[PDB]
Amino acid sequence: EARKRELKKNKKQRMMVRAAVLKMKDPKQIIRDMEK
Amino acid sequence: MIEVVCNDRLGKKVRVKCNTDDTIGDLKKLIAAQTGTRWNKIVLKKWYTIFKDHVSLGDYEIHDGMNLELYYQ
Amino acid sequence: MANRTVKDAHSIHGTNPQYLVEKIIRTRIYESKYWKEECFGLTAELVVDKAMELRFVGGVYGGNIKPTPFLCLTLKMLQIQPEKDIIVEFIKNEDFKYVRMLGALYMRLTGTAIDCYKYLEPLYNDYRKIKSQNRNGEFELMHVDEFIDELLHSERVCDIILPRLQKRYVLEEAEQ
Amino acid sequence: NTQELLDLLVKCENKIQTRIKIGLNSKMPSRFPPVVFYTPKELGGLGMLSMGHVLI
Amino acid sequence: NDEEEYEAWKVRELKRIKRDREDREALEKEKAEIERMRNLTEEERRAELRANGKVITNKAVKGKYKFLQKYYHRGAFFMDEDEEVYKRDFSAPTLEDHFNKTILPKVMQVKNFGRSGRTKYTH
Amino acid sequence: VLKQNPFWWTHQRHDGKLWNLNNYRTDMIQALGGVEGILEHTLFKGTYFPTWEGLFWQIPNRRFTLWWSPTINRANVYVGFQVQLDL
RNA sequence: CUCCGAACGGUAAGAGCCUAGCAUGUAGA
Numbered sequence: 001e002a003r004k005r006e007l008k009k010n011k012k013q014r015m016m017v018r019a020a021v022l023k024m025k026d027p028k029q030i031i032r033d034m035e036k
Numbered sequence: 037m038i039e040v041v042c043n044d045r046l047g048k049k050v051r052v053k054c055n056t057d058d059t060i061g062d063l064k065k066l067i068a069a070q071t072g073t074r075w076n077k078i079v080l081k082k083w084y085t086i087f088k089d090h091v092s093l094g095d096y097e098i099h100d101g102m103n104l105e106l107y108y109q
Numbered sequence: 110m111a112n113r114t115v116k117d118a119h120s121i122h123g124t125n126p127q128y129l130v131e132k133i134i135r136t137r138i139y140e141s142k143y144w145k146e147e148c149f150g151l152t153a154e155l156v157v158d159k160a161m162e163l164r165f166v167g168g169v170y171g172g173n174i175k176p177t178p179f180l181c182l183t184l185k186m187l188q189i190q191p192e193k194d195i196i197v198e199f200i201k202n203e204d205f206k207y208v209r210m211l212g213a214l215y216m217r218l219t220g221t222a223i224d225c226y227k228y229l230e231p232l233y234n235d236y237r238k239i240k241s242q243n244r245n246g247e248f249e250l251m252h253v254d255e256f257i258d259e260l261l262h263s264e265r266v267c268d269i270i271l272p273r274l275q276k277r278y279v280l281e282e283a284e285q
Numbered sequence: 286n287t288q289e290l291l292d293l294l295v296k297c298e299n300k301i302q303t304r305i306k307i308g309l310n311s312k313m314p315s316r317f318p319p320v321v322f323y324t325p326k327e328l329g330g331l332g333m334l335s336m337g338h339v340l341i
Numbered sequence: 342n343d344e345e346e347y348e349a350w351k352v353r354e355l356k357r358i359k360r361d362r363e364d365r366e367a368l369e370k371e372k373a374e375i376e377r378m379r380n381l382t383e384e385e386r387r388a389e390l391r392a393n394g395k396v397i398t399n400k401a402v403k404g405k406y407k408f409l410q411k412y413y414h415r416g417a418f419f420m421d422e423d424e425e426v427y428k429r430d431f432s433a434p435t436l437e438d439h440f441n442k443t444i445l446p447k448v449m450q451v452k453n454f455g456r457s458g459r460t461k462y463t464h
Numbered sequence: 465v466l467k468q469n470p471f472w473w474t475h476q477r478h479d480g481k482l483w484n485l486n487n488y489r490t491d492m493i494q495a496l497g498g499v500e501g502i503l504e505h506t507l508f509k510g511t512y513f514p515t516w517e518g519l520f521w522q523i524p525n526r527r528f529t530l531w532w533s534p535t536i537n538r539a540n541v542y543v544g545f546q547v548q549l550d551l
Numbered sequence: 552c553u554c555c556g557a558a559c560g561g562u563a564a565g566a567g568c569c570u571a572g573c574a575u576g577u578a579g580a
Contacts, residue, residue, distance in 0.1 A: 089172075
């Protein structure tokens with residue numbers, strides 16, 4: 001029962017971490033600055 | 037004889053009892069006679085898999101309980 | 110931009126200026142190949158050029174609702190909202206056929222029932238052939254009488270729903 | 286001989302059916318074919334030796 | 342084929358003109374048929390004349406639900422058409438009525454954790 | 465002991481085994497449709513395996529929700545809100 | 552022996568490009 005909610009919270013945290021990692025090294029943030 | 041569920045998330049959950057070797061035209065006829073609509077406007081999808089009105093029912097491999105997304109044309 | 114007619118339009122009393130056709134069918138009319146071309150603007154003149162070059166008379170074809178250029182052009186002229194004189198000019202043209210067909214269809218969708226009988230009645234004499242697209246894609250050659258009969262007497266002769274014209278007996282008892 | 290005993294066995298089986306069909310998805314579907322249960326572990330099921338009438 | 346077109350243009354004009362007059366007189370014919378049935382009901386025959394067919398658009402040729410086969414509703418939205426798809430005798434087991442529902446231990450209405458209703462028509 | 469062991473019936477050593485169950489499985493496999501029928505839901509229809517041979521190796525949870533994934537992820541069980549994966 | 556149910560628990564999250572039905576009605580010089 002609650003294990004589903006725990007796994008969903010863990011997956012949401014992992015997705016947020018992946019989004020932050022892709023945005024921090026993003027082409028519009030990192031590679032865009034690398035070309036500047 | 038098969039019981040199909042023409043369903044939708046908009047307050048239209050109909051259950052039509054149709055024949056085994058029947059077509060999809062008569063199935064649309066039943067779904068239109070039951071809920072609120074005419075025959076030529078109904079469209080029975082399943083994730084963008086548009087069911088056409090010339091193939092048969094058992095030929096598309098539908099069985100008792102298969103729910104189908106209703107959409108108006 | 111296909112929202113307004115130009116800047117202001119005399120709203121047909123039925124539903125709305127652009128909404129005499131069902132919302133689903135008009136929403137399908139917009140996103141289409143035939144709409145992508147000629148949507149740059151068609152006010153009065155280029156409509157005649159686009160009308161004489163489409164020898165189909167039909168509504169929807171295919172499982173996916175695909176509008177004929179006849180139907181999309183009816184909708185385009187409906188958004189343009191031409192004056193009554195231009196429509197009478199299209200209704201009086203005997204050389205080009207489908208132009209007259211579109212003129213009659215538009216005068217039916219937007220127009221007074223008295224005007225409907227006054228302008229569409231004398232279109233009930235031509236015994237010529239007219240091509241149409243069925244719902245399964247296959248075409249059929251029918252008579253013009255069949256078209257105007259389904260238009261004046263029957264409901265939804267095409268994919269569009271008609272705006273409830275009276276029975277002729279009431280008008281014959283009250284008017285001409 | 287105990288009718289209440291058999292009825293309660295059936296109720297307990299239909300309860301443990303819950304979360305063995307509901308643990309996968311939070312829907313409690315209509316049918317969820319019974320054979321997913323009564324296959325032994327020798328083939329790779331559960332081994333749910335049943336007493337109540339579970340008609341296939 | 343201009344000679345044939347003008348020949349059929351009258352064939353359609355005659356039918357279309359026939360439908361108009363046939364529709365006007367129908368209002369009087371319907372009232373007249375009630376008048377004919379009025380005198381027919383009055384002094385035709387005391388249980389000695391029908392002149393009828395008991396015509397119905399779609400005959401519901403029902404059967405007998407086995408033990409708890411669901412009450413399937415055909416849906417009363419389109420019956421004037423008299424489509425043959427309706428005449429199929431919806432008295433069959435759809436999904437789970439194939440069973441006997443008598444060998445079961447005591448009873449099983451619905452095992453879905455929602456049995457709000459309680460009725461079988463025993464009384 | 466801190467575990468209620470159902471041993472009041474008898475003793476497995478002195479009294480022996482109280483029950484016998486292989487004839488239950490022998491009838492169950494027949495009632496489920498035989499080996500091929502009771503199995504036929506699983507994904508071995510594939511798997512580079514022609515016949516039934518011994519190959520037994522969230523391990524069991526995934527193994528179970530996969531081995532019956534077609535017998536579970538069908539349309540005649542859940543509602544018909546069909547959902548496609550990314551790929 | 553006719554009593555027929557619906558929603559949520561459901562569709563990963565993503566960076567580049569693009570298009571749009573809607574909304575204010577005024578203070579003041």
